[PDB]
Amino acid sequence: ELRDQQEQVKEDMETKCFICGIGNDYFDTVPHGFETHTLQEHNLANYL
Amino acid sequence: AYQQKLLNYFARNFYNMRMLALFVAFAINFILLFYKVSVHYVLEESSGYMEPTLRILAILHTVISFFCIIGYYCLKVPLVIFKREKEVARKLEFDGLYITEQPSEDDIKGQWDRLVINTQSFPNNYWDKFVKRKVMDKYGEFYGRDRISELLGSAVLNSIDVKYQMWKLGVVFTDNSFLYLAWYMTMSVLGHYNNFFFAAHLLDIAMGFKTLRTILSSVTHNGKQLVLTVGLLAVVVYLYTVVAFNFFRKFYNKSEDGDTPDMKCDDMLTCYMFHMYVGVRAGGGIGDEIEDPAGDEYEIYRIIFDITFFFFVIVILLAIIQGLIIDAFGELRDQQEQVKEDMETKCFICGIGNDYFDTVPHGFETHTLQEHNLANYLFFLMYLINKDETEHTGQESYVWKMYQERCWEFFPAGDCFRKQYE
Amino acid sequence: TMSVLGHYNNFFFAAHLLDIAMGFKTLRTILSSVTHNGKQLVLTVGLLAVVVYLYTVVAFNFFRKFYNKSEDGDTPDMKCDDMLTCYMFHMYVGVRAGGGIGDEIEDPAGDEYEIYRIIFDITFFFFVIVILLAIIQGLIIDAFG
Amino acid sequence: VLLTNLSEHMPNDTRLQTFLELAESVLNYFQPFLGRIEIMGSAKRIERVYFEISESSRTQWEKPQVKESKRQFIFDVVNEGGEKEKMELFVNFCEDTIFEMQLAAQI
Ligand SMILES: Nc1ncnc2c1ncn2[C@@H]1O[C@H](COP(=O)(O)OP(=O)(O)OP(=O)(O)O)[C@@H](O)[C@H]1O
Ligand SMILES: Nc1ncnc2c1ncn2[C@@H]1O[C@H](COP(=O)(O)OP(=O)(O)OP(=O)(O)O)[C@@H](O)[C@H]1O
Numbered sequence A: 001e002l003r004d005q006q007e008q009v010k011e012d013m014e015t016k017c018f019i020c021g022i023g024n025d026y027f028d029t030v031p032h033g034f035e036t037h038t039l040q041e042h043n044l045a046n047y048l
Numbered sequence B: 001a002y003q004q005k006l007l008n009y010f011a012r013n014f015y016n017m018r019m020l021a022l023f024v025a026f027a028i029n030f031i032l033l034f035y036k037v038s039v040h041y042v043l044e045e046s047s048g049y050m051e052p053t054l055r056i057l058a059i060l061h062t063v064i065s066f067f068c069i070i071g072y073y074c075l076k077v078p079l080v081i082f083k084r085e086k087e088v089a090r091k092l093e094f095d096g097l098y099i100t101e102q103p104s105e106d107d108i109k110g111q112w113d114r115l116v117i118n119t120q121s122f123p124n125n126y127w128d129k130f131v132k133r134k135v136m137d138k139y140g141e142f143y144g145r146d147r148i149s150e151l152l153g154s155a156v157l158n159s160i161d162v163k164y165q166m167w168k169l170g171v172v173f174t175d176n177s178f179l180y181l182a183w184y185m186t187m188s189v190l191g192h193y194n195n196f197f198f199a200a201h202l203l204d205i206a207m208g209f210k211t212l213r214t215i216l217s218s219v220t221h222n223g224k225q226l227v228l229t230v231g232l233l234a235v236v237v238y239l240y241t242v243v244a245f246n247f248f249r250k251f252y253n254k255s256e257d258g259d260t261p262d263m264k265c266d267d268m269l270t271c272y273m274f275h276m277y278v279g280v281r282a283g284g285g286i287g288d289e290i291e292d293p294a295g296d297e298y299e300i301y302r303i304i305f306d307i308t309f310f311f312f313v314i315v316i317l318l319a320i321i322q323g324l325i326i327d328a329f330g331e332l333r334d335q336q337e338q339v340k341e342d343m344e345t346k347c348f349i350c351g352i353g354n355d356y357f358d359t360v361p362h363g364f365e366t367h368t369l370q371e372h373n374l375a376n377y378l379f380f381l382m383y384l385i386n387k388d389e390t391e392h393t394g395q396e397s398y399v400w401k402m403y404q405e406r407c408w409e410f411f412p413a414g415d416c417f418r419k420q421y422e
Numbered sequence C: 001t002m003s004v005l006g007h008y009n010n011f012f013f014a015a016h017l018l019d020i021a022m023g024f025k026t027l028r029t030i031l032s033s034v035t036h037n038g039k040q041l042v043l044t045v046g047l048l049a050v051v052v053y054l055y056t057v058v059a060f061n062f063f064r065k066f067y068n069k070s071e072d073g074d075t076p077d078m079k080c081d082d083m084l085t086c087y088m089f090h091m092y093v094g095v096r097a098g099g100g101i102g103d104e105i106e107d108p109a110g111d112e113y114e115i116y117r118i119i120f121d122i123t124f125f126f127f128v129i130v131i132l133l134a135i136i137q138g139l140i141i142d143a144f145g
Numbered sequence D: 001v002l003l004t005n006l007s008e009h010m011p012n013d014t015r016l017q018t019f020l021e022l023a024e025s026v027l028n029y030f031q032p033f034l035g036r037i038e039i040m041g042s043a044k045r046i047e048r049v050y051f052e053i054s055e056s057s058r059t060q061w062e063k064p065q066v067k068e069s070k071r072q073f074i075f076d077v078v079n080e081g082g083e084k085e086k087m088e089l090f091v092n093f094c095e096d097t098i099f100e101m102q103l104a105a106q107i
């Protein structure tokens, strides 16, 4: 269960935004889009 | 050229040669099962000349190992040197890493190739022998035409690129499979010297039966976890060695009855190796191979020490190591099964699914016998390369243009043909 | 034919206990679970035999002065040095041992080869009793799952 | 190819259908030899290509070593990879598989 929690953290840190919480697939119709969706769009450091 | 004709015979017949070398190694260690202390010598529940056949098969096996390393050197080494040349040639053009970007002292495998730039056969296998002037005229405007273009630049002995050949061997030697076969050749040689450790060729049952290969990959999947856990176990054993040293050294007699010349093991440099060899693989913890209390002062502390050793070594930590290895097996077989699953419910390219191509009966199999069927992109790309430029259609020139552009939008993302229409 | 050849000799007329498997429909799943993973289990057992054979090579070539089943050795001492012998020794004794090999063998008490001996002991313990028996167990319980 | 293209692009028409039924014996020879893939040719919709498969290329592709290179590639890509860089890995595979294909022809 502990390793499953570690892996689930490192999973939903890569198929969701933390904020708009949508998903990976919707930001992949555009190529490379989800990475831009957290290099420009929400990118949690910028709210800070 | 008959040398080259004989060279064709090797690489045409590589895998069967390697499998037959495994068969020879089985036969030789079958023979070497029969040994006897006397100097060593073999009897015979066999024909009279089994020792001359051992003398035959040692030479025979070393012949087959040398034979197959020649076949492998002239089989797959051109492909590996091709992939290396292509990667380096693209990183000269699209990056200029020896010109602008300057990779650091890190990544020596990416830093080996600095002394192959000015080699004249850098496009040996790249189908593009004009990379030189291309990157010259794309960049040598700025960083000096002269310096950049200079940086790009017995008769058969006088007609080979020596420095390039050195670089070629330098990329040959770093390879895994080449290192493996060279090791295998040297072990057949040093079993030809001493046939005692000629039995080390049993390792090929792993490298070559493709499920034992998963077994042997499962010993190194969880490396940093397993090494840290074994170090943790050593720390626990060392701490109990500290306790046993400082409080319980009067329980150490391997000897019988102690009036016989009694031996102890309470030393820090001894008690430790005692608990390692004895207490770890014990099964009964430590209370088997040690004195037991029978009404001492320290009886209760002794039983506490015994039970805590039992729990925090044999109950938990051995199960941790076992569970880590069986976890690695579960994940490896799950990856094998996931490959063979999503090779059958998705297209690799349009990536849609199985169910959508099953409204029509038998449809998904036709959706990868006609529609995408990955071999045909390979074939069609060969078709584009091999035709002349001037006879492309609109789509053929379009795809050729995109491929020269390297931008990759013509592969359908989620848009098979049948989806487009009703 | 087994009822006939128990009618002849009723010693092995007891072989008809096999029908509890073929006929209670959960033991049938149990007995199908011995042959589900055939090629994996046979290859793994062959791998274990290869590891045992390689350690037989090492024990032959460097450590045969530790083989006395006899009491005190002045009694007519028996060794297990022969390649074919040491091999069947590690099979019958070392595999089902549980303590690896260091129980049913001489122990070092200040020899030259003491450290090499303990390395040999620990590596036998790990690469047989820790891992491979658990591999076989896990393969069977995986087939049941 | 042209009868094929009229059939595939324009189905449900009985006249071409009858004609193709009278044209059956040629396609059955050439069905192994033509291939047909999907792209998007700048029109922002799905186009279809037809092309030609050389005999020796196919019949020396499918046997020797390239099956294992294929396995290796499929294994490495389906196990792991970024979602958009997979196709560039495929073209890298396609490129050196073509080189290997010529080299296996060279034997
Ligand atoms: N809302 C979000 N905020 C931040 N990252 C997100 C978000 N949604 C998805 N991600 C993904 O999570 C990853 C965050 O990276 P990460 O948190 O590892 O930062 P790092 O600097 O790489 O390492 P560290 O974890 O030490 O900060 C990014 O790769 C990004 O793709
Ligand atoms: N895009 C795709 N390309 C190829 N095959 C696909 C694709 N999508 C689904 N498949 C399915 O994957 C399977 C590929 O078969 P496979 O790769 O095993 O070829 P093979 O010749 O049977 O064996 P090998 O693996 O040695 O090539 C086919 O049965 C096909 O149904």
Ligand SMILES: Cn1c(=O)c2c(ncn2C)n(C)c1=O
Pocket: B127, B385, D095, D098, D099
């Ligand atoms: C000539 N040539 C090419 O032009 C080529 C290629 N692969 C891609 N291209 C573009 N190969 C293998 C090739 O031989």
Ligand SMILES: [Ca+2]
Pocket: B390, B391, B392
């Ligand atoms: Ca034209």
Ligand SMILES: [Zn+2]
Pocket: A017, A018, A019, A020, A021, A042
């Ligand atoms: Zn968001």
Ligand SMILES: [Zn+2]
Pocket: B347, B348, B349, B350, B351, B372, B416
């Ligand atoms: Zn597709």
